Coordinates of C-alpha atoms in Angstrom, one line a residue:
Chain A
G1 CA 97.3 45.1 118.3
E2 CA 97.0 47.4 121.2
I3 CA 100.6 47.2 122.2
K4 CA 101.6 48.3 118.6
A5 CA 99.1 51.2 118.8
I6 CA 100.5 52.3 122.3
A7 CA 104.1 52.1 120.8
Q8 CA 103.2 54.2 118.0
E9 CA 101.7 56.7 120.4
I10 CA 104.7 56.8 122.6
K11 CA 107.0 57.3 119.5
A12 CA 104.9 60.2 118.5
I13 CA 105.2 61.7 121.9
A14 CA 108.9 61.1 122.1
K15 CA 109.4 63.0 118.6
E16 CA 107.3 66.1 120.1
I17 CA 109.4 65.9 123.2
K18 CA 112.7 65.9 121.2
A19 CA 111.5 68.9 118.8
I20 CA 110.8 71.0 122.1
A21 CA 114.2 69.9 123.7
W22 CA 116.0 71.2 120.5
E23 CA 114.0 74.5 120.9
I24 CA 114.9 74.8 124.6
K25 CA 118.7 74.2 123.5
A26 CA 118.4 77.0 121.0
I27 CA 117.0 79.4 123.7
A28 CA 119.8 78.3 126.2
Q29 CA 122.7 78.7 123.9
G30 CA 121.0 82.0 122.6
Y31 CA 120.9 81.2 118.9
Chain B
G1 CA 99.4 42.2 129.3
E2 CA 102.7 42.7 131.3
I3 CA 104.4 44.3 128.3
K4 CA 101.0 46.5 127.6
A5 CA 101.3 47.6 131.3
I6 CA 104.9 48.8 131.0
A7 CA 104.0 50.5 127.6
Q8 CA 101.1 52.3 129.4
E9 CA 103.6 53.4 132.3
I10 CA 106.0 54.7 129.5
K11 CA 103.2 56.7 127.7
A12 CA 102.3 58.3 131.1
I13 CA 105.9 59.3 131.7
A14 CA 106.3 60.6 128.1
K15 CA 103.2 62.8 128.5
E16 CA 104.6 64.1 132.1
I17 CA 107.9 65.0 130.3
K18 CA 106.2 66.6 127.4
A19 CA 104.2 68.7 130.1
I20 CA 107.3 69.8 131.8
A21 CA 109.1 70.7 128.4
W22 CA 106.1 72.9 127.5
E23 CA 106.3 74.6 130.9
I24 CA 110.1 75.2 130.3
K25 CA 109.5 76.6 126.7
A26 CA 106.9 79.0 128.2
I27 CA 109.1 80.4 131.1
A28 CA 112.1 80.6 128.9
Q29 CA 110.5 83.3 126.8
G30 CA 109.4 85.2 129.7
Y31 CA 106.0 83.6 129.7
Chain C
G1 CA 111.9 38.2 127.5
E2 CA 113.6 40.6 125.2
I3 CA 110.6 43.0 124.4
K4 CA 109.8 43.2 128.2
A5 CA 113.4 44.2 128.8
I6 CA 113.5 46.8 126.1
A7 CA 110.4 48.2 127.7
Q8 CA 111.9 48.4 131.1
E9 CA 115.0 50.1 129.7
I10 CA 112.7 52.7 127.8
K11 CA 110.8 53.4 131.2
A12 CA 114.3 53.9 133.0
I13 CA 115.6 56.3 130.5
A14 CA 112.2 58.1 130.6
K15 CA 112.6 58.5 134.3
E16 CA 116.2 59.9 134.0
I17 CA 115.0 62.5 131.3
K18 CA 112.3 63.5 133.7
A19 CA 114.8 64.2 136.5
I20 CA 116.9 66.3 134.1
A21 CA 113.8 68.1 132.9
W22 CA 113.0 69.2 136.5
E23 CA 116.6 70.4 137.0
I24 CA 116.3 72.4 133.8
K25 CA 112.9 73.9 135.0
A26 CA 114.4 75.1 138.2
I27 CA 117.1 77.0 136.2
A28 CA 114.4 78.4 133.8
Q29 CA 112.6 79.7 136.8
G30 CA 115.6 81.6 138.1
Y31 CA 116.7 79.1 140.9
Chain D
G1 CA 108.2 42.1 114.5
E2 CA 106.8 45.6 114.1
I3 CA 106.5 46.0 118.0
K4 CA 110.3 45.2 118.5
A5 CA 111.2 47.7 115.8
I6 CA 109.2 50.5 117.2
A7 CA 110.4 49.7 120.6
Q8 CA 114.1 49.9 119.5
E9 CA 113.2 53.4 117.6
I10 CA 111.6 54.8 120.9
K11 CA 114.6 53.7 122.8
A12 CA 117.1 55.5 120.3
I13 CA 114.9 58.6 120.4
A14 CA 114.8 58.5 124.3
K15 CA 118.4 58.4 124.4
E16 CA 118.7 61.3 121.9
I17 CA 116.3 63.3 124.3
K18 CA 118.3 62.4 127.2
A19 CA 121.6 63.6 125.5
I20 CA 120.0 66.9 124.4
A21 CA 118.6 67.3 127.9
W22 CA 122.2 66.9 129.4
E23 CA 123.5 69.4 126.8
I24 CA 120.8 72.0 127.7
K25 CA 121.7 71.6 131.5
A26 CA 125.5 71.9 130.7
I27 CA 124.9 75.2 128.7
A28 CA 122.5 76.5 131.5
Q29 CA 125.3 75.7 134.1
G30 CA 128.0 77.1 131.8
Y31 CA 129.9 73.8 131.7

């Protein structure tokens, strides 16, 4: 139900945040 | 309903973190 | 029980991530 | 069930994002 829907949405946002964090790490280390 | 409320809190803080990550990704390319 | 605890644990880690993201943002801004 | 499994997935991605955020702060601080 609703709690499963909300948990799938949080997992999608968490995977988006992790992809942006790896992009930021690339810029911080310059490669 | 108590677990759904904590999941909605988590989704809000995840959207806040994604917003800040986008602000960093912009700034860190000189945008 | 356990599902409420896992949700509380996620919320605490998300708050920690948000605090680190603000610190990273300040450096990215030049401060 | 599925809610517990997605919650444990979220908590593992959150801990990966916290680790990358601390790696980015280390690199930006020259630690």
